[PDB]
């Protein structure tokens, strides 16, 4: 079952995959590759373990500090000086500008949605890569952005009252984004190109654009184009003109659809949205990443570039696919896909850098044309780092991998998640540690909330999970991230990103509220579906992010004291029914997510909460819920009987929600026989003892336990 290379014992399925699938076409010699793996693992594992031990030592000191605190209001001056003494809060370096070069325009310049998808799901990954262009009509008709009120309800058949509202919404979008010199797109009867500029026919007169430079191109004949291509805030809009179509036949100008450039970049996720606990799982993911980079992943295939005629009459093309990042796992976990001679598992983050890096070489070379970075970069998101020494380690790991792969130094770029408190409070130093590799920072606010709870676990009971979004610490955290990014010269060089919209069915709400993120100067933010990407694209047409960033330059809007404000609840805060609701809600969301993780290896699941809101769950939202209940149990807000009773009460409700689903095995009534139930319980009752409250140690162990049982 294993292959010996030096000190390593490689699972045969991984050895075969790399030799037969990943290496051919890279001109890397297999024996040299595997010797490189052995040397990188041997050389870098000590520092990897040392960093993990440092996390544990720091947390132990903070725990003890809070237990020895007498004064009720935390003396913030004493707290801050303590974090400085133990090396948690480090000195801020002098101002600098990042030097990362060779980065694609989608990252340096284009503000727009960033889509995250589990790499183990080939169909979702394909749809994500293809989500660079998406139908606004479909996004509006298929979601609640257009209310299902007055005869506008969806049904088995196309509803023209609803379709007309879709059309009107899109016409107002055009008026607001590419305004006519006079009149409205709602009254357009036709489009032509005359002397290289767009002419819109109105019933009374004709008109051009208020800014004719927004006219980017067209398809078909200039006198009766089959489509018109507009650009606004660097994002493209395509009006499809087809009077013979069913929609276009009813349209006053024969418009069939409005196509939005949507998911500019996509993150193919190996981390919190997938369940991969052994070599077999990792190979499934690596193979999908390989198919994406070679261009031949198919279930349904990857799109080619798009051909246009320039306003002046020449030819040009536009990228048809989303520019792909890969999210590697972070520094914590090992995986038995490789073990050493003594049987120790190899760090999974090290493996991901080698193998996803190797596979990404295919995306730098011809498919027809090369799939991904035309400028020669490989884009890796590195999650869950704690402070600048951990960022420096990632950079050293990437350097060593580049040597093994024979790639130019600094080929492998890094998207830094700002999703751990020791990174937040040292963010300037963290960016500087990666100043020649960094291509984004992003506030992973869900992980950051989990780390907020775990770090101050001993200080007292935290506010309810739903209250966290309005706490001083998180508002400071979001502003601080933008400030540090802009201060490091990110405008025009690297993305400043914000976090995930999880309410998959509440697209009217997303359109209403997620505009806050580009208004806050973020040049990208996360969505979980191609449809959400198309709708979030609307916000970048309304908000001039480049303008917003220029206005924000130089501002210092968060103090260290605000960043360090612990989200403690006030005494007497909750009635029994409020406590009960928090416990039930958290138990339901935990059980709903964990049961499909452990029994079916699904790392991202839509789970209705106690208010029947469909939430896209992954490990970070699980980290919050389990840590909050662990915190409430730790400080006596709830008893161990309360937790067990809530889990038992919500488990059959999860069983019912899954009912069919044929691979689903119920948790109730024999709770002590359900590995999934016991994993959910363990995440709560052992939550305080998990490193930084991470969920992977328990999830991976319980999933492997489930697989072992299904094997015998
Ligand atoms: O805020 C973080 O810590 C972060 O990393 C976000 C996620 O990973 C996430 C959360 C929910 C659904 C989903 O698809 C994803 Br990708
Ligand atoms: Mg302890
Ligand atoms: Mg995260
Ligand atoms: Mg509260
Ligand atoms: Mg504008």
Measured in degrees and rounded to the nearest 5, phi and psi for residue 651 equal -55, -50
Q: Binding site annotation covers 440?
A: no
- Does the Cβ of 225 fall within 6 Å of ligand 1? no
* 656 among known catalytic residues: no
- Cis bond upstream, residue 286 (ω within 30): no
Residue 425: helix, strand or coil by DSSP?
Answer: coil
Distance CA 286, CA 43 (A): 24
CA distance 296 to 660: 33
CB atoms within 10 A of CB 250: 14
Same-domain check for residues 416 and 303: yes
Among 197, 229, 261, where does a domain finish?
A: 261
CA dihedral 271, 276, 280, 285 (to 10 degrees): -30
How far apart CA 517 and CA 163 sit, in angstroms, is: 29
Q: Kindly write down the DSSP assignment for every residue of 466-524, as one continuous string.
A: GGGGGSHHHHHHHHHHHHHHHHTT-TTTSEEEEEE--BTT-HHHHHHHTTHHHHTT-SE
Separation in Å, CA 315 to CA 112, 225, 242, 309: 25, 15, 22, 5
Please tell me whether residues 284 and 306 are part of one structural domain: yes
CA dist., res. 255 & res. 516, Å (int): 31
- Residue that the structure tokens 């390989």 belong to: 290
Question: Where is the domain boundary, 527, 553, 569?
Answer: 569
Positive or negative: CA dihedral 34, 39, 45, 47: negative
**What Rg value do the Cα atoms of the chain yield, rounded?**
26
Structural contact between residues 598 and 508, judged by C-beta atoms closer than 8 angstroms? no
**Cβ atoms < 10 Å from Cβ of 366:** 10
Residue 560 neighbours by CB distance under 10 Å = 15
Q: Which residue out of 445, 503, 620, 693 has the highest number of ligand 1 atoms within 8 Å of its CB and is therefore the one to mutate?
A: 620
Single out the residue of 158, 160, 166 nearest to residue 141, CA to CA: 166
- In this structure, are residues 268 and 128 in contact, taking their beta carbons and an 8 Å threshold? yes
The CA 417 to ligand 3 mean position distance, Å, reads 7
Show the tokens assigned to 124.
């979702």
| Omega of the bond leading into 22 within 30 degrees of 0 (cis) | no
Point out the catalytic residue in the list 9, 327, 422, 702. 327
- The token pair that represents 487 in the structure block: 């201060």
Q: Which atom of ligand 1 is nearest to the CA of 604?
A: 14
* CA angle (418, 428, 113) in 5-degree steps: 40
The first and second tokens of residue 87, run together, are 């090396």
Of 251, 418, 618, 642, catalytic: 618
C-beta atoms surrounding 20 within 10 Å: 10
Query: What is the DSSP track for 125-176?
Result: HHHHHGGGEEEHHHHHHTSTTS-S-SS----SS--HHHHHHHHHHHHHHHHH
CA angle centred on 127, ends 402 and 315, rounded to 5° = 80
Q: Resolution in angstroms for this experimental structure?
A: 1.6
Q: Helices (DSSP H) in 181-332: which residue ranges?
A: 246-250, 279-294
Residue 269 CB less than 6 A away from ligand 1: yes
Among 569, 590, 617, the domain boundary falls at 569
Query: Binding site annotation covers 300?
Result: yes
Distance CA 632, CA 99 (A): 45
Q: Which of the 8 DSSP states describes residue 460?
A: -
Q: How many CB atoms lie within 10 A of CB 99?
A: 12
Structure tokens at 212: 């004719």
Would you state the structure tokens that stand for residue 525, as one six-digit string? 């933010």
Q: Do residue 356 and residue 469 come from a single domain?
A: yes
- Backbone torsions φ then ψ of 267, nearest 5 degrees: -105, 110
Experimental method: X-ray
**E strand or H helix at 80, and its extent?**
helix 76-85
- Cβ(500) – ligand 1 distance below 6 Å: yes
Distance 232 CA to ligand 5 centre (A): 7
Q: Which two tokens stand for residue 357?
A: 């890096």
The CA–CA distances, whole Å, from 620 to 457, 468, 536, 617 equal: 17, 14, 22, 8
Mapped onto helix, strand or coil, the DSSP state of residue 318 is: strand
Ligand 1 neighbour 604 (Cβ under 6 A): yes
CA distance 406 to 409: 9
Q: Do 464 and 574 share a domain, yes or no?
A: no
Q: How far is the CA of 691 from the centre of ligand 2 (A)?
A: 11
Phi/psi of residue 594, nearest 5 degrees: -70, -35
Among all chains, which residue has been given the structure tokens 């024996």? 31
139 and 116, same structural domain?
no
Examine the residue annotation and report whether 374 is marked as an active-site residue of this protein.
no
- Please tell me what DSSP assigns to residue 566: -
Q: Per the structure, how many domains does the chain have?
A: 3
> Residue 20: CB partners within 8 Å, gap ≥ 6?
none
User: 630: domain range?
Assistant: 570-712
Place of tokens 């979601």: 143
**Residue 114 in contact with ligand 1 by CB distance below 6 A:** no
In this structure, what token pair is assigned to residue 271?
Answer: 């981390």
Residue 324 DSSP SS3 = strand
Question: Reduced to 3 states, what is the DSSP secondary structure of residue 256?
Answer: strand
Residue 111 contacts residue 523 (beta carbons within 8 Å)? yes
Breaks (C-N over 2.5 A) in the chain follow: 299, 367
Question: Long-range CB contacts (< 8 A, 24+ apart) of 338-347?
Answer: 338/8, 338/9, 338/10, 338/11, 338/14, 338/37, 338/41, 339/2, 339/8, 339/9, 340/7, 340/8, 340/9, 340/41, 341/7, 341/9, 346/8, 346/41, 346/45, 347/41, 347/44, 347/45, 347/48
Which phi and psi angles does 608 have, rounded to 5°? Answer: -70, 140
Q: What is the 3-state secondary structure (H, E, C) of 643-674?
A: HHHHHHHHHHHHHHHHCCCCCCCCCCCCHHHC
Of all protein residues, the one whose alpha carbon is nearest to atom 10 of ligand 1 is 618
Q: Residue 305 has what DSSP assignment? A: P
CA-nearest residue for atom 8, ligand 1, is 272
Residue 615 bridge partners (DSSP) = 503, 607
DSSP single-letter state for residue 688: G
CATH no. for residue 589? 1.20.1220.12
331 in the same domain as 315:
yes
Q: Give, in order, the Cα–Cα distances in Å from 258 to each of 134, 236, 246, 248, 401.
A: 9, 11, 15, 11, 44
Give the span between the Cα atoms of 364 and 26, in whole angstroms: 10
For 43, the enclosing helix (H) or strand (E) is helix 30-67
Which of 694, 696, 701, 618 is closest to 454 using CA atoms? 694
- Give the C-alpha separation, 411 to 101, whole Å: 9
Measured distance CA(163)–CA(186) in Å, rounded = 14
446 marked as part of a ligand binding site: yes
Do 311 and 347 lie in a common domain? yes
CA–CA gap between residue 215 and residue 164 (Å, rounded) = 26
Strand 495-500, strand 438-443: pairing = parallel
Is 196:311 a contact under the CB 8 Å cutoff? yes
Verify that 545 and 409 share a domain, yes or no: yes
Quote the DSSP letter at residue 344.
Answer: P
Is the same domain home to 424 and 552? yes
Q: Same structural domain for residues 564 and 575? A: no
Backbone angles phi, psi at 221, to 5 degrees: -75, 145
Q: In what order do the strands lie in the sheet with 255-261?
A: 133-135, 255-261, 235-241, 227-232, 215-219, 306-309, 315-318
- Which conformational region is residue 86 in: left (phi greater than 0), alpha (psi within -120 to 50 degrees), or beta? alpha
271 touches ligand 1 (CB under 6 Å): no
Q: Which of 19, 15, 20 is nearest to 4 (CA)?
A: 15
Looking at the structure, tell me whether residues 82 and 17 fall in a common domain: yes
β-pair type (227-232, 215-219): antiparallel
CA of 177 to the centre of ligand 5 (A): 7
Rounded Cα–Cα distance for residues 107 and 264 (Å): 9
Tell whether 665 is in a known binding site. no
Tell me the two tokens of residue 668: 């109730």
The dihedrals phi and psi of 140, each to the nearest 5 degrees, come to -80, -45
The verdict on the CB of residue 502 being under 6 Å from ligand 1 is yes
Tokens describing residue 65: 């500090």
d(CA 369, CA 383) in angstroms, rounded, equals: 31
Q: Is the dihedral of CA 688, 690, 692, 694 positive or negative?
A: negative
478 close to ligand 1 (CB < 6 Angstrom):
no
Q: Do 386 and 57 form a contact (C-beta atoms < 8 A)?
A: no
Residues 554 and 609 in one domain: no
Instruction: Please tell me the number of the ligand nearest to residue 234's CA.
Output: 5
Angle at Cα 692 formed by Cα 686 and Cα 693, nearest 5°? 35
Atom of ligand 1 nearest to the CA of 616: 12
Annotated binding-site residue? 448:
no
CB 675 within 8 A of CB 598: yes
Q: Look at phi and psi of residue 410 and say left if phi exceeds 0, alpha if psi is from -120 to 50, else beta.
A: left
Q: Where do we find the tokens 């916000």?
A: 539
The CATH number linked to 45 is 3.20.20.360
Quickly count: other Cβ atoms within 10 Å of residue 298's Cβ. Answer: 10
Strands across the sheet containing 206-207: 190-194, 197-201, 206-207
What letter would DSSP give residue 21?
I
């Amino acid at each position: 079952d294993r292959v010996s290379v030096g000190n390593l014992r490689i699972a045969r399925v991984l050895y075969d995959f790399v030799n037969n699938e990943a290496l051919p076409g890279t001109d890397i010699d297999p024996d040299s590759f595997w010797a490189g793996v052995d040397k990188v693992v041997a050389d870098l594992t000590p520092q990897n373990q040392a960093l993990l031990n440092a996390r544990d030592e720091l947390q132990a000191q903070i725990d003890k500090w809070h237990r020895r605190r007498v004064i009720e209001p935390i003396d913030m001056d004493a707290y801050r000086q303590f974090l400085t003494e133990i090396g948690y809060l480090l000195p801020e370096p002098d101002d600098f500008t990042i030097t990362t070069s060779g980065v694609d325009a989608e990252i340096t310049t284009t503000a727009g949605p960033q889509l995250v998808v589990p790499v183990l799901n080939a169909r979702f990954a394909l749809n994500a890569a293809n989500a660079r262009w998406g139908s606004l009509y479909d996004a509006l008709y298929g979601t609640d952005v257009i209310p299902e009120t007055d005869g506008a309800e969806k049904g088995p058949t196309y509803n023209k009252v609803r379709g007309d509202k879709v059309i009107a919404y899109a016409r107002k979008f055009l008026d607001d984004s590419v305004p006519l010199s006079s009149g409205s797109f709602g009254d357009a009867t036709g489009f032509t190109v005359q002397d290289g500029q767009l002419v819109v026919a109105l019933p009374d007169k004709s008109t051009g654009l208020a800014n004719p430079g927004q006219f980017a191109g067209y398809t078909g004949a200039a006198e009766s184009p089959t489509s018109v291509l507009l650009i606004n805030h660097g994002l493209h809009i395509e009006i499809l003109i087809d009077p013979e179509s069913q929609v276009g036949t009813t349209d006053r100008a024969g418009v069939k659809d409005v196509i939005l450039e949507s998911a500019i970049t996509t993150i193919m996720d190996f981390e919190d949205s997938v369940a991969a606990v052994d070599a077999a799982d990792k190979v499934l993911g690596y193979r999908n990443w390989l198919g994406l980079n070679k261009g031949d992943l198919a279930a349904r295939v990857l799109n080619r570039d798009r051909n246009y005629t320039a306003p002046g009459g020449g030819q040009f093309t536009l990228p048809g696919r989303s520019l792909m990042f890969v999210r590697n796992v972070g520094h914590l976990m090992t995986n038995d896909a490789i073990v050493d001679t003594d049987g120790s598992e190899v760090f999974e983050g090290i493996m991901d850098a080698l193998f996803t890096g190797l596979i990404a070489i295919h995306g730098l070379k011809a498919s027809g044309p090369l799939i991904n970075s035309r400028t020669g970069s490989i884009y890796i998101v590195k999650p869950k780092m704690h402070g600048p020494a951990e960022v420096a380690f990632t950079c050293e790991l990437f350097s060593r991998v580049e040597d093994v792969l024979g790639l130019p130094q600094n080929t492998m770029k890094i998207g830094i998640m700002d999703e751990e408190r020791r990174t937040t409070v040292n963010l300037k130093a963290c960016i500087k540690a990666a100043a020649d590799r960094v291509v984004f920072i992003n506030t992973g606010f869900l992980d950051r909330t989990g780390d907020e709870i775990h770090t101050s676990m001993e200080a007292g009971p935290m506010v309810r999970k739903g209250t966290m979004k309005s706490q001083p610490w998180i508002l400071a955290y979001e502003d601080h991230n933008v400030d540090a990014g802009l201060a490091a010269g990110f405008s025009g060089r690297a993305q400043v990103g914000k976090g995930m919209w999880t309410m998959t069915e509440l697209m009217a709400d997303m359109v209403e509220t997620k505009i806050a993120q580009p208004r806050a100067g973020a040049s990208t933010a996360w969505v979980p579906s191609p449809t959400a990407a198309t709708l979030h694209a609307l916000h970048y047409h309304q908000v001039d992010v480049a303008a917003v960033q220029q206005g924000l330059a130089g501002k210092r809007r968060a103090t260290i004291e605000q960043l360090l404000t612990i989200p403690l609840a006030k005494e007497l805060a909750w009635a029994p029914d409020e406590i009960r609701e928090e416990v039930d809600n958290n138990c339901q969301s935990i059980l709903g997510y964990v049961v499909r993780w452990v029994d079916q290896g699904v790392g991202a699941s839509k789970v209705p909460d106690i208010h029947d809101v469909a939430l896209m769950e992954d490990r970070a939202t699980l980290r919050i819920s389990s840590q909050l209940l662990a915190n409430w149990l730790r400080h006596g807000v709830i008893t161990s009987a309360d937790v067990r009773a809530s889990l038992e009460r919500m488990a059959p409700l999860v069983d019912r929600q899954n009912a069919g689903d044929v691979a689903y095995r119920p948790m109730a009534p024999n709770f002590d026989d359900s590995i999934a139930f016991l994993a959910a319980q363990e995440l709560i009752l052992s939550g305080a003892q998990q490193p930084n409250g991470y969920t992977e140690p328990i999830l991976h162990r319980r999933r492997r336990e489930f697989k072992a049982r299904a094997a015998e």
